[PDB]
Paper text:
Giardia intestinalis is a protozoan parasite that causes diarrhea in humans. The highly compact and uniquely GC-rich Giardia ribosomes possess eukaryotic rRNAs and ribosomal proteins, but retain some bacterial features. Using single-particle cryo-electron microscopy, we have determined high-resolution structures of six naturally populated translocation intermediates, from ribosomes isolated directly from actively growing Giardia cells. The translocation intermediates, with naturally bound tRNAs and eukaryotic elongation factor 2 (eEF2), display characteristic ribosomal intersubunit rotation and small subunit’s head swiveling—universal for translocation.
State A represents an ensemble of ribosomal POST-T states with a strong density for the E-site tRNA with occupancy of ∼91%. The most populated state (A-I) shows a completely closed L1-stalk and E-site tRNA, while the other substates (II through VI) show snapshots of a continuum of movement of the L1 stalk with the final state (A-VI) having no bound tRNAs and an L1-stalk angle of 39°. The stable binding of the E-site tRNA is ensured through interactions of the CCA end of the tRNA to 28S and eL42, similar to the POST-T state structures of S. cerevisiae ribosome. Compared to state B, the SSU head in state A occupies a conformation having undergone a 19.6° reverse swivel. With this, the SSU head achieves a conformation quite similar to state C (with a minor 2.5° deflection). Interestingly, the A state(s) exhibit an additional rotation of the SSU with a different rotational axis, which is similar to previously reported eukaryote-specific ‘subunit rolling’. To understand whether Giardia ribosomes exhibit subunit rolling, we compared the classical PRE-T state ‘C’ with the POST-T state ‘A-I’. A clear 4.6° rotation of the SSU toward the A site could be observed in transition from the POST-T to the PRE-T state, along with formation of the B6 and B8 bridges. Reverse swivel of the SSU head marks completion of translocation, leading to the final POST-T state, represented by state A of Giardia ribosomes.
Residue numbers in the entry:
A (entry chain SK): 1 to 176
B (entry chain SI): 2 to 174
C (entry chain SE): 2 to 261
D (entry chain SM): 78 to 154
E (entry chain SO): 2 to 140
Write the structure that this text describes.
RNA sequence: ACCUCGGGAAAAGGAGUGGCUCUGACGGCGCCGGGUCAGAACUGGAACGGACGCGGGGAUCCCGACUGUUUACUAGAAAC
RNA sequence: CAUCCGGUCGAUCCUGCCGGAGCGCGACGCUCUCCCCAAGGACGAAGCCAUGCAUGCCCGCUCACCCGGGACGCGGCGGACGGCUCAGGACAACGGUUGCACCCCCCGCGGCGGUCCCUGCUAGCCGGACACCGCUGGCAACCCGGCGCCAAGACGUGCGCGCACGGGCGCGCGCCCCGCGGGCGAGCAGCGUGACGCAGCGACGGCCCGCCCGGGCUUCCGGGGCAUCACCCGGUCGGCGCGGUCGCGGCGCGCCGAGGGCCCGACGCCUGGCGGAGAAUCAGGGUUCGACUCCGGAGAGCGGGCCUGCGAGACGGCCCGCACAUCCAAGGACGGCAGCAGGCGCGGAACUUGCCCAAUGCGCGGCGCGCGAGGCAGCGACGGGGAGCGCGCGAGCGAGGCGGGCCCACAGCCCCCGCCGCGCAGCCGAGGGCAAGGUCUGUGCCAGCAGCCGCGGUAAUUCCAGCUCGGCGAGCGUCGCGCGGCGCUGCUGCAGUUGAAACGCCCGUAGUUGGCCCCCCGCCGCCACGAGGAAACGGGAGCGCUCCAGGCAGGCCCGUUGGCCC
RNA sequence: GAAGGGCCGCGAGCCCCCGCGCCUGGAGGAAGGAGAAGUCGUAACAAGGUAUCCGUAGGUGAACCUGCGGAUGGAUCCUU
């Protein structure tokens, strides 16, 4: 009854076991300073995505080589991590997936990519520009600062053609 | 109505069972209809052969015999079989009450008129035990069919060591 | 539940139909016909889902009612009509003729055939019985009862029906060295020659079949379906039931996406 | 029982919480044919049949004799 | 010592079932004496009419007058003693005015200097007590 | 319930019962005795231990344990 | 996805619990910028119901009228599915695995289509006999009575070909067993003959058989707790003969025998007890919950009983008893929301008497309707997901509004496009645990706070305000409970000299446990690998819904996919 | 062949007994816990002024005392 019931849903964040650890409160604030994050949930999501990927890597490393699952599932984890750019292209092994940080999840995010391309003066600048849809990846405008681009789309990231090139010519304050 | 369900029965250990459901049409049982033999044909003709069809599962009609008077009786050795009036029920293994009321049930020893089988007397060397019953006008036979389900009272003439067992049972009277 | 079940839930319907979970609460329930619910796909799914000739269920009725579709050469107007292994699904107006065989994964595949192929239909004799006055009769998987079968044809053999005349054109026996496609079961679609017949009296006969690649596959003899004596004598899917491994399947998927 | 026998089928049941097993017994009611002679302890072979009684769905098709003073022994047969 | 035989699973399963009861927590979770005894009867909270406003003394070494109301729970007609929390909150609660009472937070044990009060008022006459204290809604 | 474990107890309570017509059991067989105990029909103004013979019962308290014995001819008792 | 920390003391080391700290999924308080997704009167009231609606469709038969527009009625099929709920039920239900040589089945598919008679055919095709209908009534209502006309693919009969042919009968294998076979693993099926019977269908040909689908049982293993329940059951356990059923069977009865089940827990009781696929939490091992989506069971106030049908012991069928309604003109009638809204009661707790058959099914019907199935909208901080509350130094949005487009059964939302343009935060804390003032008042063991330890008795780091500050965040606090914590239940993995705790001793059955030894064999467990058995879910291949939770898509493509696992 | 009747079968509901579970009213007894700040002694802990304590029996305002047999957790690891 109601196909809505059959639609799935999941939690994408994992709160810390201890919430008031001073070393782990300060480090999260630094990781909000360099990445322009609104709330700690965004860092928790980053650790949930990394932990799952690391758990796949650890359950495959324990498995013997030439066991078919290690060859197939491991190649699919590596390919995904290479396509996103989380895994450096040169490493090409399962062990290097275990030795990764949430810095690699954050770097692929669009807000950090715009600063690297020098389009954004800061990460705080980029967040506002993406909310104002001034950024297009591969010809598609994005409004999400956690879009996370793939290595191929890195070059195709550009200022939205219809936004800051002034095709409108009367944008916001200029109009009036 | 009547139920052949084992839910009412106790377990092997003798424990009580639990009534998880109400009675179902599939586990229905029907009131038994004892085929009474019409031995009163001379007294009245109002009681004629009355067989009643009943509606069952799958629309499979079952013929229930309420009153019967005749049956096809077969002497297997001689291969002589003829429709014969059934005179009386003498001996039923389950109870003597069925013999008194003259109910026709499968395996009830019945006495049949020998007038159809009178021809067999002419050929000798055809089982002396059957032949002297033929002369007497009553032959020991047993109903071989179920009157309640089939609607007929077909049988066979008791022969060999069977005839001896049932004639010994009815020997004193 | 008081009687026969007239409805099928989408989550309940068999996986080989490949019905999307969000598509509906309900799934098409096949009518009773030549094939069983598990061993058949309805005509609505073989038209609206595979060929997309009808974009909605009402349009499947409109094209089925017009007898445009022909199944085994029969008009077969029922929307939920079962279509199964070896049935000839041909639409003359679009000039397309299809024979339903099983693919390597195990889903049904509408294979393009030729006019000579369309004429014959392959059937497996499940049982030979003395019914109707002790007259000999055979029973094929597609619910076909043929009286007076050739005395030799045994059970498990494959007969070929003329369709127009409904006569057995030829019989292929079930024996070692005979081309067989396993219909149903974990090994489904796979094509191989019988290499072993293990009786296991009182239970199920276990048939081991060998692919051209040399991969040995074992299945119960009910699923096994003889195709011919040394060659299929029927159209076989492009894969020809060699069956790919998971790493090979990954490679074919990557190749297809790259040429987008 | 008259023309009937009770068979003690012995089987192990495995639990996961404790990697050990539980020795378990089930008494199944069979029908002794008058042809077969049996003593309490013999290994019988029982084959499924139509319900023959409330508790009997089996019939003895083979008898293996034992030395009477055969101890007991949990035996999966 | 413990039993370690490949076929002694039954003993270990029985020992665990028997000795599980020694803990008060397993008993206060499965015995069911608590469910019948509790005036909340396993509910998250209950509703009930005020009968008496009582000044309850704090336990030593604390010297104070904690403020509470005796409440007869509509659900089981059972009078409990419930502390009214915060400062001057009792003034909001009148007599016979209906109060929603939840437990203190020790799962049915009396908490703090207050003795025997396992319950505290959360809503007076359908109005949250904390709201009447923060002056968000009037009485 | 209680109890000295013997009792209480016919506890308390219910149900059937006639006449006919049969059917089983049970010894000593060819024979030949038995008169009890079951079971079934069928009947009868809704009748049956049809007269007769033949406990009303239950809960307490006091006293004397009990069976006995006694003031023949006013006390059978808790008295002896 | 392997973490602890505060509290017994003068101090210390322990045991040991208490309290914290994480997550769930409900209640509650307070507050809320926008979009996406989405549960939703289950929770000791399976209490109760006002109102509307949830099951129709068809035309074989039209001298109803619109001329075939066809009203109705008759006939057909469906109303046994689906929707709902979880009361009952603890060797039951249910899940995997079996069997039916013990079975039943509408639709459809594919076969098959010989039906004695006497009387008595009309087969170029037979009767009568009702409904609607007309006419005349009773009737508070409900309900229907009489008379008259006239039809069906309806009804009643019947023209049939003695290899006529439904049922059930009687008879027809053996020679120690196993090896062609219509068929099997197996003596099963079919038929030949002798009697019986005379079934069906043939008045617009279906009996019949296979297949299918559902059912009925049935085989094995799993299938709550309590011993302050240790002995239990007597159709109970077997056998035999009947009956009965769709059929097997103590299912039932008659008769004979005394079995059957138990510390490997019988039986009894109890269950704020549907089961499973699953879910919560989590290193591993585990624990707890299984009202709800899919599957199987059960029930429609409670007991029964029934009819119709192929299938119902049916309740949107009927009959009856009880409980409780309803109307009444007082004679009578008349129900049954654990369908969907909605109300009432109860509780801590739970949505609109909305719309619509367009999708997805199903019932009937080639041209198409019906559906409170299902879809859409509303409500809705159950919850999940994605963005805001600026960037910066002069430019920019989106929140809106207003238009168009798109979308839609109809709107709407989303999104696209022009035009105006108007960012906007809570809730808990700051002595420790546990992140954050030794700030300034008030108060003065009072008031209060404080899960815990503790603060308050005039220099309150703990209260009541201000100030400042921390955490998390459009959410945060509180309560209840499950899991983790907790090697504080210990299989992994606990302890018993003294902290809680070796039975006073000995024998001893059940139980559990038993040295070494034979390579090469049969049975067991065992490990590996297969078959075969629903998905969803949980993974997981591949695919940029703008990301995302999702979904199974997509793009000129393996026969594009949707693999594979559990 | 209708109403109706009979006998059985399936089987409500009511009655009457008897169990069984659950919840309770109740003089008058009788423990435990929390106050209060009371009264009467001072039992134990220092050889606690009679070393404690264990079983068992008796007694006694009350902690307790005493008999008999233990133990040391004693106040003794120690003497032809």
């Amino acid at each position: 009854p109601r196909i809505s019931r059959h639609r799935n849903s999941s939690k994408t964040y994992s709160t810390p076991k201890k919430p008031f650890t001073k070393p782990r409160l300060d480090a999260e604030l630094k990781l909000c300073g360099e990445y322009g994050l609104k709330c700690k949930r965004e860092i928790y999501r980053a650790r949930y995505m990394l932990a799952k990927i690391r758990r796949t890597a650890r359950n495959l490393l324990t498995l013997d080589e030439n066991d078919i699952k290690r060859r197939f599932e491991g190649a699919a984890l590596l390919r995904r991590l290479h396509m996103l750019g989380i895994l450096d292209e040169e490493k090409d092994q399962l062990d290097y997936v275990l030795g990764l940080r949430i810095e690699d999840i954050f770097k692929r995010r669009l807000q950090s990519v715009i600063v690297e391309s020098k389009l954004a003066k800061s990460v705080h600048h980029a967040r506002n520009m993406i909310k104002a849809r001034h950024i297009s990846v591969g010809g598609q405008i994005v409004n999400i600062p956690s879009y996370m681009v793939r290595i191929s789309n890195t070059s195709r990231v550009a200022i939205a053609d219809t936004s800051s090139l002034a095709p409108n010519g009367k944008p916001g304050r200029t109009k009036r | 109505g009547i139920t052949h369900d084992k839910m009412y029965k106790r377990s092997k250990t003798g424990a009580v069972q639990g009534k998880w459901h109400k009675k179902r049409k599939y586990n229905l049982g029907r009131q038994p209809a004892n085929t009474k033999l019409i031995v009163k044909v001379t007294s009245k003709k109002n009681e004629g052969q009355k067989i009643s069809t009943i509606r069952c599962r799958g629309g499979n009609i079952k013929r229930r015999a309420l009153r019967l008077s005749h049956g096809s009786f077969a002497w297997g050795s001689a291969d002589i079989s003829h429709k014969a009036r059934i005179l009386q029920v003498v001996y039923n293994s389950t109870s003597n009450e069925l013999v008194r009321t003259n109910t026709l049930v499968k395996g009830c020893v019945v006495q049949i008129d020998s007038a159809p089988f009178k021809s067999a007397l002419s050929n000798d060397t055809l089982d002396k035990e059957i032949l002297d019953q033929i002369r007497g006008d009553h032959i020991l036979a047993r109903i071989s069919s179920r009157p309640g389900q089939v609607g007929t009272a077909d049988g066979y003439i008791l022969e060999g060591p069977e005839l001896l067992f049932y004639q010994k049972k009815l020997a004193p009277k | 539940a008081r009687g026969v079940r007239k409805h099928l839930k989408r989550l309940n319907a068999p996986k080989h139909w490949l019905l999307d979970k969000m598509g509906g609460i309900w799934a098409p329930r096949p009518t009773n016909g030549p094939h069983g619910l598990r061993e058949c796909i309805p005509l609505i799914l073989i038209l609206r889902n595979r060929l997309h000739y009808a974009n909605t269920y009402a349009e499947t009725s409109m094209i089925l009612q017009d007898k445009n579709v022909l199944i085994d050469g029969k008009p077969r107007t029922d929307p939920t009509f079962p279509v199964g292994f070896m049935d000839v699904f041909e639409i003359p107006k679009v000039h397309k003729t299809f024979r339903v065989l099983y693919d390597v994964k195990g889903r049904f595949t509408l294979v393009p055939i030729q006019s000579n192929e369309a004429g014959f239909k392959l059937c497996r004799v499940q049982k030979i019985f003395l019914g109707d006055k002790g007259m000999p009769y055979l029973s094929t998987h597609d619910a076909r009862t043929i009286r007076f079968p050739h005395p030799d044809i045994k059970t498990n053999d494959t007969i070929k029906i003329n369709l127009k005349t409904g006569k057995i054109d030829e019989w292929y026996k079930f024996d070692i060295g005979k081309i067989v496609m396993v219909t149903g079961g974990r090994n489904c679609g796979r094509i191989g020659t019988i290499q072993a017949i293990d009786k296991h009296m009182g239970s199920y006969t276990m048939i081991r079949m060998k692919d051209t690649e040399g991969t040995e596959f074992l299945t119960r003899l009910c699923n096994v379906f003889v195709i011919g004596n040394d060659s299929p004598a029927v159209a076989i899917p492009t894969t020809k039931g060699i069956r790919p491994d998971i790493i090979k399947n990954r490679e074919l998927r990557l190749r297809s996406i790259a040429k987008r | 029982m008259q023309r009937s026998i009770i068979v003690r089928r012995d089987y192990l049941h495995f639990v996961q919480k404790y990697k050990r097993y539980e020795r378990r017994h089930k008494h199944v009611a069979a029908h002794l044919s008058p042809c077969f002679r049996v003593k309490e302890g013999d290994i019988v072979t029982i084959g499924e049949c139509r319900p023959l009684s409330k508790t009997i769905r089996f019939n003895v098709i083979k008898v293996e004799p034992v030395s009477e003073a055969a101890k007991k022994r949990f035996s999966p047969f | 010592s413990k039993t370690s035989g490949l076929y002694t699973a039954r003993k270990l399963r029985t020992v665990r079932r028997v000795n599980r009861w020694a803990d008060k927590k397993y008993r206060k979770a499965h015995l069911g004496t608590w469910l019948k005894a509790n005036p909340l009867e396993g509910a998250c909270m209950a509703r009930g009419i005020v009968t008496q406003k009582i000044g309850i003394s704090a336990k030593q070494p604390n010297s104070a007058v904690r403020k509470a109301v005796r409440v007869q729970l509509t659900k089981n007609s059972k009078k409990i003693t419930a502390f009214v929390p915060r400062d001057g909150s009792i003034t909001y609660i009148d007599n016979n005015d209906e109060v929603l009472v939840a437990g203190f937070g020790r799962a049915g044990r009396a908490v703090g200097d207050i003795p025997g009060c396992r319950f505290k008022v959360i809503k007076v006459a359908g109005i949250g007590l904390l709201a009447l204290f923060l002056r968000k809604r009037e009485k």
